[PDB]
Amino acid sequence: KVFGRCELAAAMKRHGLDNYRGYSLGNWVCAAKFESNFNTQATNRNTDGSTDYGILQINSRWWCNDGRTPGSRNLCNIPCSALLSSDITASVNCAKKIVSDGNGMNAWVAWRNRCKGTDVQAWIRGCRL
Numbered sequence: 001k002v003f004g005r006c007e008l009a010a011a012m013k014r015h016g017l018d019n020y021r022g023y024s025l026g027n028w029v030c031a032a033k034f035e036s037n038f039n040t041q042a043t044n045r046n047t048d049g050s051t052d053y054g055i056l057q058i059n060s061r062w063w064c065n066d067g068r069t070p071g072s073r074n075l076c077n078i079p080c081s082a083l084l085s086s087d088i089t090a091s092v093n094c095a096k097k098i099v100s101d102g103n104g105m106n107a108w109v110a111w112r113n114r115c116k117g118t119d120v121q122a123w124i125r126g127c128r129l
Contacts, residue, residue, distance in 0.1 A: 001086035003038040005029065006127035008055070008088075013129055015092040021099045025129070026120030027111065028095075032056060033123065034110040040091070041084045054083030054091045056108065063094055 003011065009029050012018070018025040035057040036042035044052045050061040050069045060069040064080035076097055082090035098107050105111045 001040045003032075003040070003055070005033075005038065005123065008032060008038050009124045009127045009129060011088055012092065015089060017092060017095070018129075020096060021104060023099065023105055024120060026123040027105060027115060029123040030115035030118070030120045031105065031108050031111040034114045035108065040086060040088065043084070051080065053080045055088060056083075056091055056095050057110075058083055058091065058094050058098065063098065 009025055012028050013025055017023070017028045032038055032055045036055045038055065040055050042052075042054060042057065044057060046052065046059070048061065050059050050072065051066055052059050053064060053066070058064060058076070060066040060080050061072040063074070063076045064078050064083060065072070065074040066080035076094035078090050078094065083094065099105055101107060105116070
C-alpha cells in the first residue's frame, strides 16, 4: 500500500507514534517519506546481505526474520514480510523497540541525514489529526 502523507500521519498517530520517546509525529512521517516514499512494500538489499523492509525500512540483521540474513536476530519477533502489510501495526510496534534502543531516531540513517533538525512539522501541515 502507498499511503498518502496525511493518511500515514493519521495511521501513525492512531498507533501511538506521536511524541513516542519524544519524537513528534512530523519526525516519523519525514522518516517514512525518505525511507520508503510511504510505500509499505518497499524493500532494499544492503551490502552486508541484510534487507530493509516496509514504510520505515527495518533491517533483517537485528529486527525481523527473513530466513536469509546469516547470523541475524529477530528482536521484534516477526517475519520481515509482516512489515510489508497494508496494516502498519507490525512496523510501528517494531519501530517503538528500535527507537527505544539507545540512539533514538538516529537508528534511521535517512532520518539523521534528511529530517533531524529540519522543520519536521511541515510533514503534517494540513492534516486532520
